[model samples]
Target: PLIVPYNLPLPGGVVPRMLITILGTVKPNANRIALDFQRGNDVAFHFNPRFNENNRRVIVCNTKLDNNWGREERQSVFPFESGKPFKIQVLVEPDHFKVAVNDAHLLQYNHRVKKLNEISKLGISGDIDLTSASYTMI
Candidate 1:
């Protein structure tokens, strides 16, 4: 099992047609989980699933740069649940990041930080069990 709060240094950088996969289980008492693609201290893609929104169950995706967070993109469809296992696939595109949860298409986040090659780190944290997180060119 991978350690929590894992800051994975991505080798060979990111590009279009890159496929990133995450296999994990949500903690039974999970409040949130975060999968962030980072460029130094900047967050290129902030993929967050929060279960503590007072039962509203929303997933808020956003970007952060120079310590300032950008406008959040919210999704109401909750594909992740407490105590459930999940598979997350992120396909890198020229214009956006396409995400699929449990093998189902979920969302596309348009790149705020457009230099895909600048994304050299992946940070995983919060209340979840990480089985594996891997990336490969497709």
Candidate 2:
């Protein structure tokens, strides 16, 4: 699942938002995920840099998939920054397909995709450094 296209930075007015929490049961059940890329538009999923507005925006919550998630669920606030490098989020939910980056706290959980509409086909594969990203389906 390591195909990052590099471009992650973030800070141009900082209105980023890429949150997808639901990591659990990779084989016991549940699967159907999506999130692979390499197209154009210089990769996407959010990151804008320009910094210097006084320099102070550390936001940090946590979600490296939390051991494949599944405690009863109920954790997510803000503050994510994986040890550099990116791959952004991905999921299938019928049995597999979970890839995470920054926001998800840097995770890559099973990617088997049993069916679940086969995911919408989102792209932007490997490297890291994508600017202007956005996702909100809550």
Candidate 3:
């Protein structure tokens, strides 16, 4: 079963430079998972990992505004294993976010929404069993 957590406010909001970490284990039958940084009704960043959707293995990244999904950015190199433990680190910069998986650098997604202060909430959804999720400003 999937365990998606409700939205949690970021401490004082996410600044231009901040670090977010997620610790969790992917289920053996995992289909997908997503971590979202939201600003009111819009999603500033949507980080998603797809296990078997569309018969493709990839990490899909995107943003949402006005209930509309933006162009998806896909990464083909998957660093997650089903039923295995993993760690995800997202570092927010002035113009981009650098993401790492299992301590290895993965990919970067440019900031679609420049106003970092607008990113007031964070949440996790989809097929996953999260152990911990936290962040710190840098």
Candidate 4:
């Protein structure tokens, strides 16, 4: 397995027209998993998929600023399964992030932090295989 809580910085920083792809497997009996686009001191975006929270399955997205999380933006969806392989794509559009899972559109998150370049670091943590996290300019 790759290192846990993996963190890395983009050489050119975050920008529009960039596509991020992640391939991984959710661990069996997992409860929570997260992927984050981070600035040095703030989290630009948080992608959280919960197996059992508030008594059901759901996905949460939000930003963290000033050492506190902002209002939660949530959706009820279940595209990821335990012990199953998953493909996730995050495309940076001019206004928001388009997320695709398992080759289909899943959700869109509007820019909360406003500036993209400040979101230079990417993080992967919690119960998952995290096979790859790659970026491409398109």
What TM-score would each prediction reach against the true structure?
0.97, 0.21, 0.92, 0.96
Off by over 4 Å in 3: 1-3
Instruction: State the lDDT of candidate 4 residue by residue for 1-138, as single tens digits.
Output: 677688867765688999999888999988988989988788888999999997799999999998999999998977989999999899999889899999999999999888788788889988899888889999
- Candidate scoring better on lDDT of 2 and 4: 4
Best by lDDT: 1
- lDDT per model vs. reference: 0.92, 0.28, 0.86, 0.89
RMSD of 1: 0.8
How high is the lDDT of residue 14 in model 1?
Answer: 82
Q: Going through the candidates in order, what is the number of backbone clashes in each?
A: 0, 42, 0, 0
lDDT tens readout by residue for model 2, 119-138: 22244322233433334432
Give the true-structure RMSD of model 4: 1.0
Residue pairs clashing in model 4 are: none
Candidate with the larger lDDT of 1 and 2: 1
- Using TM-score, give the best candidate's number: 1
Q: How does residue 129 of candidate 4 score in lDDT?
A: 90
Cα misplacement distance, residue 29 of candidate 2 (Å): 39
* Candidate 4, residue 99: lDDT: 92
Q: Please, what are the lDDT tens digits per residue for candidate 3 over residues 41-88? A: 899899989988788879999999999999999999899989999999
Least well predicted 10-residue stretch by lDDT in candidate 1: 6-15
**Which segments of model 4 are wrong by more than 4 Å?**
none
Sort order, lDDT high to low: 1, 4, 3, 2
Q: lDDT by residue for model 1 over 28-118, one digit each (tens)?
A: 9889999999998999999999998987788899999998999999998789989999999999999999999998999999999987888
Please state the error at residue 19 of candidate 4 in Å. 0.5
